[PDB]
Design a protein around this nucleic acid. Sequence first.
DNA 1: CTGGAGAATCCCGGTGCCGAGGCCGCTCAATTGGTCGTAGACAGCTCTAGCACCGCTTAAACGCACGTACGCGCTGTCCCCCGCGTTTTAACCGCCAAGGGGATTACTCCCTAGTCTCCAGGCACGTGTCAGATATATACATCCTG
DNA 2: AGGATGTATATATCTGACACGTGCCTGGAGACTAGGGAGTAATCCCCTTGGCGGTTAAAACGCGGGGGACAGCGCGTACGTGCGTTTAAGCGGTGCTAGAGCTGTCTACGACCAATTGAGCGGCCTCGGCACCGGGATTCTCCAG
Lengths: 97, 97, 162, 398, 84, 84, 107, 107, 98, 98
Amino acid sequence: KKRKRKESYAIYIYKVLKQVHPDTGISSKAMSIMNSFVNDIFERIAAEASRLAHYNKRSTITSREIQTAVRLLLPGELAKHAVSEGTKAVTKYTSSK
Amino acid sequence: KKRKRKESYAIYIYKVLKQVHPDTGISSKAMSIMNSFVNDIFERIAAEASRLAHYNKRSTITSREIQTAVRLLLPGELAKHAVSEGTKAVTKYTSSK
Amino acid sequence: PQVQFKLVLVGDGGTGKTTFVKRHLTGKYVATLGVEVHPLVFHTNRGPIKFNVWDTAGQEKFGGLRDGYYIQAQCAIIMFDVTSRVTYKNVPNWHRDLVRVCENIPIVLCGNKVDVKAKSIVFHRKKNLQYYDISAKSNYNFEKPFLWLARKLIGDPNLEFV
Amino acid sequence: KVKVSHRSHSTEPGLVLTLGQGDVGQLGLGENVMERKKPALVSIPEDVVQAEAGGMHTVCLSKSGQVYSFGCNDEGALGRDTSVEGSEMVPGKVELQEKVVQVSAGDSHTAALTDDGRVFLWGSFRDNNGVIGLLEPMKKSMVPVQVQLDVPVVKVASGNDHLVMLTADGDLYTLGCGEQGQLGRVPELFANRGGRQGLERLLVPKCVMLKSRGSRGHVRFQDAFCGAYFTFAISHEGHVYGFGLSNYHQLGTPGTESCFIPQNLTSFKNSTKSWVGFSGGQHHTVCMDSEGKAYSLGRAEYGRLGLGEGAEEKSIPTLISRLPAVSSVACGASVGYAVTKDGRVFAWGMGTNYQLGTGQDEDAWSPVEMMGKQLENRVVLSVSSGGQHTVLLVKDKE
Amino acid sequence: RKVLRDNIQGITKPAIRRLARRGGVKRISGLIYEETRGVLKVFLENVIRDAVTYTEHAKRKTVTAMDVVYALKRQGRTLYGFGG
Amino acid sequence: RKVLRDNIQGITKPAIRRLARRGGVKRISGLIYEETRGVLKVFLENVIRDAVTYTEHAKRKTVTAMDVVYALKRQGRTLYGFGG
Amino acid sequence: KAKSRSNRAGLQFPVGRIHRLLRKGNYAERVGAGAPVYLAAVMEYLAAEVLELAGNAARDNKKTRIIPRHLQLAIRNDEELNKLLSGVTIAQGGVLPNIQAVLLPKK
Amino acid sequence: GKAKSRSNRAGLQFPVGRIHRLLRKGNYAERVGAGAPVYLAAVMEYLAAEVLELAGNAARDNKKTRIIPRHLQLAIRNDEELNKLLSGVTIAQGGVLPNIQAVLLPK
Amino acid sequence: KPHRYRPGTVALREIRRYQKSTELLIRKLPFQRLVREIAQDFKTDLRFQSSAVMALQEASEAYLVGLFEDTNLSAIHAKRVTIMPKDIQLARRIRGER
Amino acid sequence: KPHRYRPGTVALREIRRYQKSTELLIRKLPFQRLVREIAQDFKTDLRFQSSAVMALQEASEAYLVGLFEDTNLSAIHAKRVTIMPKDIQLARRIRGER
DNA sequence: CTGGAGAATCCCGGTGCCGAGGCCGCTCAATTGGTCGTAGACAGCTCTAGCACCGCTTAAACGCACGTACGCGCTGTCCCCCGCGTTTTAACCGCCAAGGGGATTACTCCCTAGTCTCCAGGCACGTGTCAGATATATACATCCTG
DNA sequence: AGGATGTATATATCTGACACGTGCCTGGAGACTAGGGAGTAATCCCCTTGGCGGTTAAAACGCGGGGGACAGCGCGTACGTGCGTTTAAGCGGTGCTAGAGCTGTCTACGACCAATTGAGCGGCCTCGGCACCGGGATTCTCCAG
């Protein structure tokens, strides 16, 4: 009997790493730190989006809420680049839809 | 026509005040501060109980969750006395039905 | 077929009730009342008996359930502090309330915190309620109270507490 | 300095008689007398002008001002050196060099009031969890101690575990247990030993701030009484305020909730008569009016109310029709008394304490007169009762 | 409408002193006034940016007291007394 | 299980120095060690109280790494590399 | 007739309103029956705890009415409430009087 | 026709479907928009790419082919914006930036 | 001959005066102008509620008073009764600001 | 004569050493004993995952190192190179822990 | 200011083993497709409140002069902390063993979500009557010379 | 000690902000049904605790000394105090209209459900990174000169 499946962002972090640094690896502890970092960013952005929806009496978390949460949480140029990447991704997703 | 109703803890705060200080009153700014304080306490305890339910993979916010949140949030004697008051309230509520 | 009983423990506060149930609580809830059934256990040669004990916590005086506190009871213990004799004030009231609500149920008057001892002589002579010195913090006669109640409830004049 | 005077300051010398249970020395006849079914003479070296019964002790106040006491001295209720065995069961002089004019016995404490207006308070207070002290949290005064007050006291009335001090100006000072609202100034959130502030809240005297019921000014009381766990404060205007336990409607309230702040009881609200006396046990109240009629309310079990057999719980003052005109009414734990204006005393209620002066343990649902060799040719001046005994103050008839 | 300029000088030397006295300060250096203005400018830039972001998300053109309260709360500076 | 006692002295003097060295401290007074032990004890009490609260809520007898991580997170001391 | 849940719980705070707020605040998929009662009890207890000290401060200042200054004094002079509200600013509250001993005159 | 992953449609590596399910089941809002998971995945991927690129540069500086927590710490603390973002975060086995105050250096 | 208070006396008097009051210590109109100037860099033609500027002023005054408390503690730590910019920088650096 | 380094040379060498390493600086077993001792005050017969104690130690050492960094700034702000208990007290008071 | 002596660190070139990276099978979580209801978009209107402007009053700010008390540099003293050798201690490692308890699965039932009614609790208006803000005279505390 | 100044204390005296009462309406209580969340019980195994012996690195102790903390003193100027002058805030008032707030209608977008399959997880295996020993080459510190 195999152990219960436990989900992580490991494979996706690895794919991103191979994109940025094709010849670089990552240790298990560094991978755990990166997984925690991704989960923390998810939680922060989702919580801010939830607060934005509640403040405006909106029942939905749209990409507008996510964009505003990104602008509130990430600092400086990080926010600008995150918003640019998100807009690019949503445009591409809607194009293929 | 009358404006849309806006709820507040003003009347309940006033009743509590009359209970603790029958002769003293309270101003409007103090009432606003007390309303904000009550809302902050509610939000803190509710959010901590939500985290406690999510961590333990539960779909319900019960009195156990609220009690654990109270113990996690309030310092020392406040936590003890608030736990006592909450348990007393729940026991009184259950016995009447 | 376990024998089980419902014992109501009535007395003034600070008389050792909390430290008196716990010293037999090896290690539930009265939803009607709002007090925790404490399952004491005493094996006895006749077979196990489990005194489900709920402390009224003085609510028989300050409470509103009226007969609800005693009505489920099948036996009672009246406890008071023989080092603070003021806690004998309410014993006749409790006795009358018990005999009224529950009719003929056995009751025991236990003198706690006993450790000059000339104080305890008076109650030993009163013929209304059985009087036992239970001491506590000395484990001197902490099964004597319940032994009498079990003897009366089960009806066997020779029950022991193996 | 001024000399305090109140309508409750008894000043008629008389003899002390006791009946009931004397297990812990509350009768005053020594070790050889544990139970007295009829009243029996109690020997006090000087004539007594007030005899108050506490929960388990008795305090007799002399004509010259010396407070005598006898009964259970476990928590220092007697306020005197009771080291010698047996001195608890015979009245001994309380060593208070001030001249006392009024006493009041609670359950484990006693208050003596001085001519000047200073309260001497000894013993301890008990809550539903043990002892909480007398003036310092968790410490009990085995000798008289002066309650620090900025105002003189004209009357002291003691329930079981609280002390209501009525000042010359009319205020009301309370201290002791406040779990059931008896203090009238500690909310329910804080009644459990003052909560975080501690027992300093329950044991340092403070006024019962009864809102602005007098408009700009607070209500000023002219008399204050105490049942076991509740307080009645009659205002200057005649209104009766009751704070305390009302689970059996013994405060006259329409519900069973404990009144933790003083409540103007609509049950007593009237203008054709006035309320001039109160007394309660745990669960019943007996009160008299200026006309001399005695009423009862509250729990109806064992004839506490005096209303004829078969009476049910009363949430309003009900007339005790069987009585003649009454000058004073007193309540024990489960009994009630009425002293007729011509000196006779009637009793009703639970009789298993032999408190009724009838000679039988049966419960008297209707008031009956007390008799005995120690009441013939005598006039009863006052009657007080505790949990298990009754203390009578009598006078020889001309 | 017109554009504002050089308003940090409206936080005058006496005003900064009063804030200092309320903070328990007895002697104030002459260079504190220009250092305090920079700190205040940074704090208000951080707070107002978030308030303006909340207003923009609401699709409003008026910054409200609740926008400011949320911006302050988002920085661990909860503010009671304005409808929080 | 025996009752543990006097373990704060197990944070030896050289151990505190090494923490000071990683902190960039060149010279340490002799009274620093007791103060550091008190500070560490306060910090650990605060964290372990919340960890044990979480554990007791989960009805566990074992304090897991996630309990410690949550306890740290709710004190504004988020810790990466142990889960969550 | 209809009976208030607050009255049954012996509370002044609204159990039904708090139940609705819990159910609508995206705090959890379901909300138990005793959760609003416990939370209302705790909120009422904390409000009363702050108000008792605020009224005491008002009385010390000889004021019949509680103002934000009294709330600030009550919160900051109480260690536990101060720790509970460490990162809170009370509008028009002010600060506690405090002058470092070194700054006072030598005397 | 073979099913197309929403990640491929968005041109991302991170899981759009998983993030959508976490948003739906995380008690954040009653409803979750179609584009919300895509935006959130893109932002998470961008931040991870930034941190990983800086960590890989740090690893190359230390002559290591593999990223370890030390390199993550160096990358995060040597970048002003990431350091601001993760200011309240402790990275296990990360160490500290080499930093000696100038007053402590000799001479 | 004219009466003068020795240095540090009126300062302590003021410390007492401003630790008893709750009034805002910055003037309202200059602060409103400062708020509007800062905001115009984030969005153009913004409108502000009266209570929005008041909330900002309350928060700013509280922040600066707390920062000055910390600065005063730092200055005394250096055996000084005068606060200097290096004292504010220490307070902010330790707080985690900047 | 035996070779000796001047006071402070070895201190700087150690600072450089421990700011380049990532090893835990408190001995493992004593810290585990301390954690178990503190825990039993809150619940008897507690068990700890091996990683539960490691997380506690990482957090504790990070907190102490960050505190010593602020303590060092406090000492330097007073023109000292030696850290003293008052430096820790100032750093904690400004941080909001006291 | 220089040129050795040491001591420490930084580069090696050599081994080994263990964690990282890849592969394979499986299963359950995501993708399709369709249906339905309502949440959010958009339009239109109301009228609140924010912006703007001017005039008058005056408390607050700015600018200055004089003097001092605090900041800060230099000198001494001594004692306390750093560096180094020696000894003691116990941490760390490896290994073994025994249970407590965490993690999971099945079943049951009871608690909560969702609806429909009904009505009363709480809100918005509107009003009155004090608590607090105000102005003034006064007593008292404090500070500064002396 | 006495003079000068600031602050606290005792009347006044209005002002409008509490505190209350009324009417209304919408949201909370009550009754009812349906289903699935979780409470209990039972099982498995893993991983936590306890013990035990050996090595040796680290901790503890004592020494000698130098350099850093702290005290004291001097002095220079920067800050406080206080005055006279200038200016901008604040108040009161008015007016315009921009936009917040609300309502009504519509549709398209997300929730939900059922079927299908491949993406990602668990487990296994392999070998290339990196850690670890010896062995020199610089770097740096210290001091006799």
